[PDB]
Design a protein around this motif. Structure first.
Motif, PDB file in Angstrom:
ATOM      1  N   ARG A   1      20.325  -2.863   1.011  1.00  0.00           N
ATOM      2  CA  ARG A   1      21.118  -4.060   1.253  1.00  0.00           C
ATOM      3  C   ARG A   1      22.542  -3.691   1.652  1.00  0.00           C
ATOM      4  NH1 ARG A   1      19.468  -8.744   0.454  1.00  0.00           N
ATOM      5  NH2 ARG A   1      17.227  -8.910   0.009  1.00  0.00           N
ATOM      6  N   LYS A   2      23.245  -4.667   2.238  1.00  0.00           N
ATOM      7  CA  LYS A   2      24.564  -4.408   2.812  1.00  0.00           C
ATOM      8  C   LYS A   2      25.496  -3.761   1.794  1.00  0.00           C
ATOM      9  CE  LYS A   2      25.154  -7.392   6.832  1.00  0.00           C
ATOM     10  NZ  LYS A   2      25.923  -6.422   7.667  1.00  0.00           N
ATOM     11  N   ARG A   3      25.683  -4.412   0.642  1.00  0.00           N
ATOM     12  CA  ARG A   3      26.613  -3.888  -0.355  1.00  0.00           C
ATOM     13  C   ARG A   3      26.256  -2.459  -0.751  1.00  0.00           C
ATOM     14  NH1 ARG A   3      30.544  -6.744  -3.372  1.00  0.00           N
ATOM     15  NH2 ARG A   3      31.211  -5.601  -5.239  1.00  0.00           N
TER      16      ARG A   3
ATOM     17  N   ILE B   1      34.959 -12.184  10.629  1.00  0.00           N
ATOM     18  CA  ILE B   1      36.015 -13.014  11.198  1.00  0.00           C
ATOM     19  C   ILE B   1      37.081 -13.240  10.133  1.00  0.00           C
ATOM     20  CG2 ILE B   1      34.692 -14.129  13.011  1.00  0.00           C
ATOM     21  CD1 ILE B   1      34.291 -16.520  11.003  1.00  0.00           C
TER      22      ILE B   1
ATOM     23  N   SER C   1      39.252 -14.866   7.370  1.00  0.00           N
ATOM     24  CA  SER C   1      39.011 -15.914   6.392  1.00  0.00           C
ATOM     25  C   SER C   1      40.075 -17.003   6.434  1.00  0.00           C
ATOM     26  CB  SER C   1      38.931 -15.313   4.986  1.00  0.00           C
ATOM     27  OG  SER C   1      40.108 -14.596   4.662  1.00  0.00           O
ATOM     28  N   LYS C   2      41.274 -16.701   6.933  1.00  0.00           N
ATOM     29  CA  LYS C   2      42.347 -17.680   7.027  1.00  0.00           C
ATOM     30  C   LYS C   2      42.866 -17.754   8.456  1.00  0.00           C
ATOM     31  CE  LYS C   2      43.778 -17.027   2.236  1.00  0.00           C
ATOM     32  NZ  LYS C   2      44.811 -16.505   1.302  1.00  0.00           N
ATOM     33  N   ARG C   3      43.345 -18.941   8.828  1.00  0.00           N
ATOM     34  CA  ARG C   3      43.818 -19.218  10.180  1.00  0.00           C
ATOM     35  C   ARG C   3      45.107 -20.018  10.092  1.00  0.00           C
ATOM     36  NH1 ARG C   3      40.847 -22.824  11.689  1.00  0.00           N
ATOM     37  NH2 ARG C   3      41.219 -22.940  13.945  1.00  0.00           N
TER      38      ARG C   3
ATOM     39  N   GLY D   1      38.935 -19.982   1.839  1.00  0.00           N
ATOM     40  CA  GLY D   1      38.855 -18.649   2.386  1.00  0.00           C
ATOM     41  C   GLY D   1      39.572 -17.608   1.571  1.00  0.00           C
TER      42      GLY D   1
ATOM     43  N   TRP E   1      34.048 -23.976  10.845  1.00  0.00           N
ATOM     44  CA  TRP E   1      34.694 -22.816  10.242  1.00  0.00           C
ATOM     45  C   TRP E   1      34.927 -23.026   8.749  1.00  0.00           C
ATOM     46  CZ3 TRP E   1      39.835 -22.865   8.364  1.00  0.00           C
ATOM     47  CH2 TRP E   1      40.286 -21.622   7.901  1.00  0.00           C
TER      48      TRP E   1
ATOM     49  N   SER F   1      31.747 -22.649   6.908  1.00  0.00           N
ATOM     50  CA  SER F   1      31.397 -21.238   6.797  1.00  0.00           C
ATOM     51  C   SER F   1      32.169 -20.584   5.659  1.00  0.00           C
ATOM     52  CB  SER F   1      31.664 -20.517   8.119  1.00  0.00           C
ATOM     53  OG  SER F   1      32.975 -19.979   8.166  1.00  0.00           O
ATOM     54  N   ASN F   2      33.434 -20.972   5.473  1.00  0.00           N
ATOM     55  CA  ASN F   2      34.198 -20.414   4.358  1.00  0.00           C
ATOM     56  C   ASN F   2      33.656 -20.877   3.008  1.00  0.00           C
ATOM     57  OD1 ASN F   2      35.932 -18.735   5.701  1.00  0.00           O
ATOM     58  ND2 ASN F   2      37.783 -19.935   5.304  1.00  0.00           N
TER      59      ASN F   2
ATOM     60  N   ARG G   1      31.048 -18.433   2.082  1.00  0.00           N
ATOM     61  CA  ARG G   1      31.514 -17.059   2.120  1.00  0.00           C
ATOM     62  C   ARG G   1      31.780 -16.514   0.719  1.00  0.00           C
ATOM     63  NH1 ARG G   1      35.896 -15.273   6.698  1.00  0.00           N
ATOM     64  NH2 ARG G   1      35.656 -13.005   6.497  1.00  0.00           N
TER      65      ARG G   1
ATOM     66  N   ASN H   1      30.143 -12.407  -5.810  1.00  0.00           N
ATOM     67  CA  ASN H   1      30.684 -12.136  -7.136  1.00  0.00           C
ATOM     68  C   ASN H   1      31.615 -13.269  -7.583  1.00  0.00           C
ATOM     69  OD1 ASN H   1      29.328  -9.654  -6.842  1.00  0.00           O
ATOM     70  ND2 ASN H   1      31.171  -8.686  -6.001  1.00  0.00           N
TER      71      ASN H   1
ATOM     72  N   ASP I   1      30.388 -19.448  14.277  1.00  0.00           N
ATOM     73  CA  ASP I   1      30.733 -19.715  12.884  1.00  0.00           C
ATOM     74  C   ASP I   1      29.505 -20.100  12.065  1.00  0.00           C
ATOM     75  OD1 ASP I   1      33.434 -19.107  13.225  1.00  0.00           O
ATOM     76  OD2 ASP I   1      33.937 -21.169  13.817  1.00  0.00           O
TER      77      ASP I   1
ATOM     78  N   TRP J   1      27.798 -16.899  11.233  1.00  0.00           N
ATOM     79  CA  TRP J   1      28.521 -16.243  10.148  1.00  0.00           C
ATOM     80  C   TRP J   1      28.165 -16.865   8.803  1.00  0.00           C
ATOM     81  CZ3 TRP J   1      30.215 -11.681  10.008  1.00  0.00           C
ATOM     82  CH2 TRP J   1      30.762 -11.066  11.138  1.00  0.00           C
TER      83      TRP J   1
ATOM     84  N   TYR K   1      26.437 -14.943   5.634  1.00  0.00           N
ATOM     85  CA  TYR K   1      26.945 -14.939   4.265  1.00  0.00           C
ATOM     86  C   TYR K   1      25.849 -15.345   3.287  1.00  0.00           C
ATOM     87  CZ  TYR K   1      31.456 -15.165   6.732  1.00  0.00           C
ATOM     88  OH  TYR K   1      32.526 -14.948   7.571  1.00  0.00           O
TER      89      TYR K   1
ATOM     90  N   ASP L   1      23.118 -12.687   2.470  1.00  0.00           N
ATOM     91  CA  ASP L   1      23.543 -11.426   1.858  1.00  0.00           C
ATOM     92  C   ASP L   1      23.511 -11.610   0.348  1.00  0.00           C
ATOM     93  OD1 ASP L   1      24.540  -8.985   1.159  1.00  0.00           O
ATOM     94  OD2 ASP L   1      26.562  -9.325   1.954  1.00  0.00           O
ATOM     95  N   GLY L   2      22.391 -11.239  -0.263  1.00  0.00           N
ATOM     96  CA  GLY L   2      22.225 -11.368  -1.688  1.00  0.00           C
ATOM     97  C   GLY L   2      20.786 -11.169  -2.115  1.00  0.00           C
ATOM     98  N   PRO L   3      20.425 -11.704  -3.280  1.00  0.00           N
ATOM     99  CA  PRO L   3      19.040 -11.580  -3.748  1.00  0.00           C
ATOM    100  C   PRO L   3      18.079 -12.314  -2.826  1.00  0.00           C
ATOM    101  CG  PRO L   3      20.519 -12.330  -5.507  1.00  0.00           C
ATOM    102  CD  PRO L   3      21.253 -12.480  -4.214  1.00  0.00           C
TER     103      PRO L   3
ATOM    104  N   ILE M   1      17.968 -15.582   0.392  1.00  0.00           N
ATOM    105  CA  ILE M   1      17.313 -15.428   1.681  1.00  0.00           C
ATOM    106  C   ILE M   1      16.216 -16.467   1.826  1.00  0.00           C
ATOM    107  CG2 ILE M   1      16.028 -13.856   3.171  1.00  0.00           C
ATOM    108  CD1 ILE M   1      17.462 -11.549   1.852  1.00  0.00           C
TER     109      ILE M   1
ATOM    110  N   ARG N   1      23.757  -9.653  12.056  1.00  0.00           N
ATOM    111  CA  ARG N   1      24.011  -9.500  10.628  1.00  0.00           C
ATOM    112  C   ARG N   1      23.037 -10.336   9.806  1.00  0.00           C
ATOM    113  NH1 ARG N   1      28.475  -9.623   7.360  1.00  0.00           N
ATOM    114  NH2 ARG N   1      29.597  -7.629   7.269  1.00  0.00           N
TER     115      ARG N   1
ATOM    116  N   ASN O   1      20.228  -8.943   7.127  1.00  0.00           N
ATOM    117  CA  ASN O   1      20.168  -9.427   5.752  1.00  0.00           C
ATOM    118  C   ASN O   1      18.769  -9.925   5.425  1.00  0.00           C
ATOM    119  OD1 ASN O   1      22.897  -8.891   5.315  1.00  0.00           O
ATOM    120  ND2 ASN O   1      23.531 -10.979   5.828  1.00  0.00           N
TER     121      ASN O   1
END
Lengths: 19, 426
Positions: free
Chosen positions: A4-6, A11, A13-15, B120, B160, B163-164, B167, B170, B199, B202, B206, B209-211, B215, B244, B248
């Motif tokens: 897995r990735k980790r 991109i 996170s802030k804009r 974000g 966007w 998407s955040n 994101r 943990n 976006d 993305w 996100y 990406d995990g268990p 997915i 990506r 995943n």
């Protein structure tokens, strides 16, 4: 067997708005 | 008018009891914070202006000052974690969420933007935005029969921000919130605007990406075929997140991986494995390594699409990190594959590039390659061809490298190399 990735770019996170 | 004010002037105008003077000073602040060079975020914070801006967010009777203070706070929240924290500590989250329902589209858009920056920052503020109830009004903004009726920029900012909300890890986002957001994400994933598509991909990357349960949430919505389609886009900003996401997904169960294979993803990989962007080649080869860690029928589908010569190529010439992922692909292949598939691998010319990689400095890739060589020798044992393989490894100068690895600092390398030369190369 599956990795897995980790396990061992995105991109922004802030804009800021300048318009 | 409102150009090039000093922070002192802004403070004097905001601390007057005159709503129009406060409006002028707030616009001046917005213009300071929207300049290209070194915006004075910390000076604005130290002046104590955040609570006043947050209070202006609630002046429904003065729409312009709502907009200006929203923009100023958006730009403060765009900075460091401390600056975003200053915006949150001023009470801005519920105020922005209230603005989401504003009848002025530019003000609700600005609130969307601000919430995006706040979320974000990271997991904690993301979950805090979710706890204040932002998801319902956000999704309500997108509840239209046809997304094409919405303003391009409005839709892009909404996508966007969503998407955040998907994101960071943990912890990952609340499962209930992901369930609430996914349908809208799928809809956006089928939109015709490249930035919305990027976006959305993305966001999906996100969430995947995990268990394997995460997915599964995503895959159950049937987005895999659309992800493959986007995997074949001309826009690199779309291909990158799509690839990506696909990777995943193939880190999960064999059935989830099979959904990617059945959607036709492998047909796209000849391009991806020769893509001129190093990151694409690396991600594609990592995805390959996780597919060759699957069932023998999945390895076979890799073979059928003619992807083994492309792995040989990547192993022969590529960025070293890509070569490391390719070595993993080969080791997984040889551990799970049939003797016939391993023989085919050898007939494609894997041995010589594999041996050339034994001169590398990274210890882990040496371990990986030695494991692969061992697997190939086990197959050869089943065929009585161990001697032909020994000769082949010798003719390309590989035996020299294997011998030199006996006298290596790492213990595992020592053991593996000594065992190999002792059991096969006399």
């Amino acid at each position: 067997d599956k990795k897995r990735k980790r396990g061992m770019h995105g991109i922004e996170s802030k804009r800021r708005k300048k318009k | 008018g409102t150009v090039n004010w000093s922070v002192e002037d802004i403070v004097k105008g905001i601390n007057s009891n005159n709503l129009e003077s406060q409006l002028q000073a707030t616009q001046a602040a917005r213009k300071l914070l929207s300049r290209e060079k070194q915006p004075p975020i910390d000076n604005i914070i130290r002046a104590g202006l955040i609570p006043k801006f947050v209070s202006f967010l609630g002046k429904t009777d003065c729409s312009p000052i709502q907009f200006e203070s929203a923009w100023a706070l958006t730009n403060i929240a765009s900075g460091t974690s401390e600056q975003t924290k200053a915006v949150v500590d001023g009470g801005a989250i519920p105020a922005f969420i209230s603005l989401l329902a504003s009848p002025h589209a530019h003000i609700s858009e600005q609130a969307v933007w601000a919430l995006g920056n706040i979320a974000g920052d990271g997991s904690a503020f993301r979950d805090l935005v979710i706890k204040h109830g932002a998801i319902d009004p956000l999704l309500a903004l997108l509840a239209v029969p046809d997304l094409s009726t919405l303003a391009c920029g409005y839709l892009r900012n909404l996508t966007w921000t969503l998407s955040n909300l998907c994101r960071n890890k943990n912890p990952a986002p609340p499962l209930d919130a992901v369930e609430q957001i996914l349908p809208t994400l799928v809809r956006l994933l089928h939109h015709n605007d490249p930035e919305v598509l990027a976006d959305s991909c993305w966001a999906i990357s996100y969430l995947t990406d995990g268990p394997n349960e995460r997915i599964e949430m995503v895959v159950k919505k049937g987005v895999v075929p659309q992800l493959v389609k986007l995997l074949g886009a001309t826009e690199l900003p779309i291909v990158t997140p799509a690839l990506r996401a696909i990777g995943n997904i193939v880190t999960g169960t064999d059935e989830q991986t099979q959904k990617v294979i059945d959607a036709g993803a492998l047909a796209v990989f000849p391009s991806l494995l020769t893509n001129p962007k190093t990151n694409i080649q690396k991600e594609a080869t990592w995805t390959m390594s996780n597919i060759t860690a699957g069932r023998q029928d999945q390895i076979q589908q890799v073979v059928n699409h003619g992807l083994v010569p492309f792995l040989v190529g990547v192993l022969s010439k590529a960025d070293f990190k890509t070569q490391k992922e390719a070595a993993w692909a080969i080791t997984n292949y040889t551990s799970g594959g049939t003797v016939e598939q391993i023989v085919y691998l050898v007939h494609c010319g894997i041995i010589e590039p594999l041996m050339n990689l034994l001169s590398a400095k990274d210890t882990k890739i040496i371990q990986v390659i030695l494991d692969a060589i061992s697997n190939i020798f086990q197959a050869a044992e089943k065929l009585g061809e161990t001697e032909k393989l020994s000769i082949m490894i010798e003719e390309c100068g590989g035996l020299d490298k294997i011998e030199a690895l006996q006298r290596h600092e790492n213990e595992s390398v020592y053991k593996a190399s000594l065992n190999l030369i002792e059991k096969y190369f006399s």
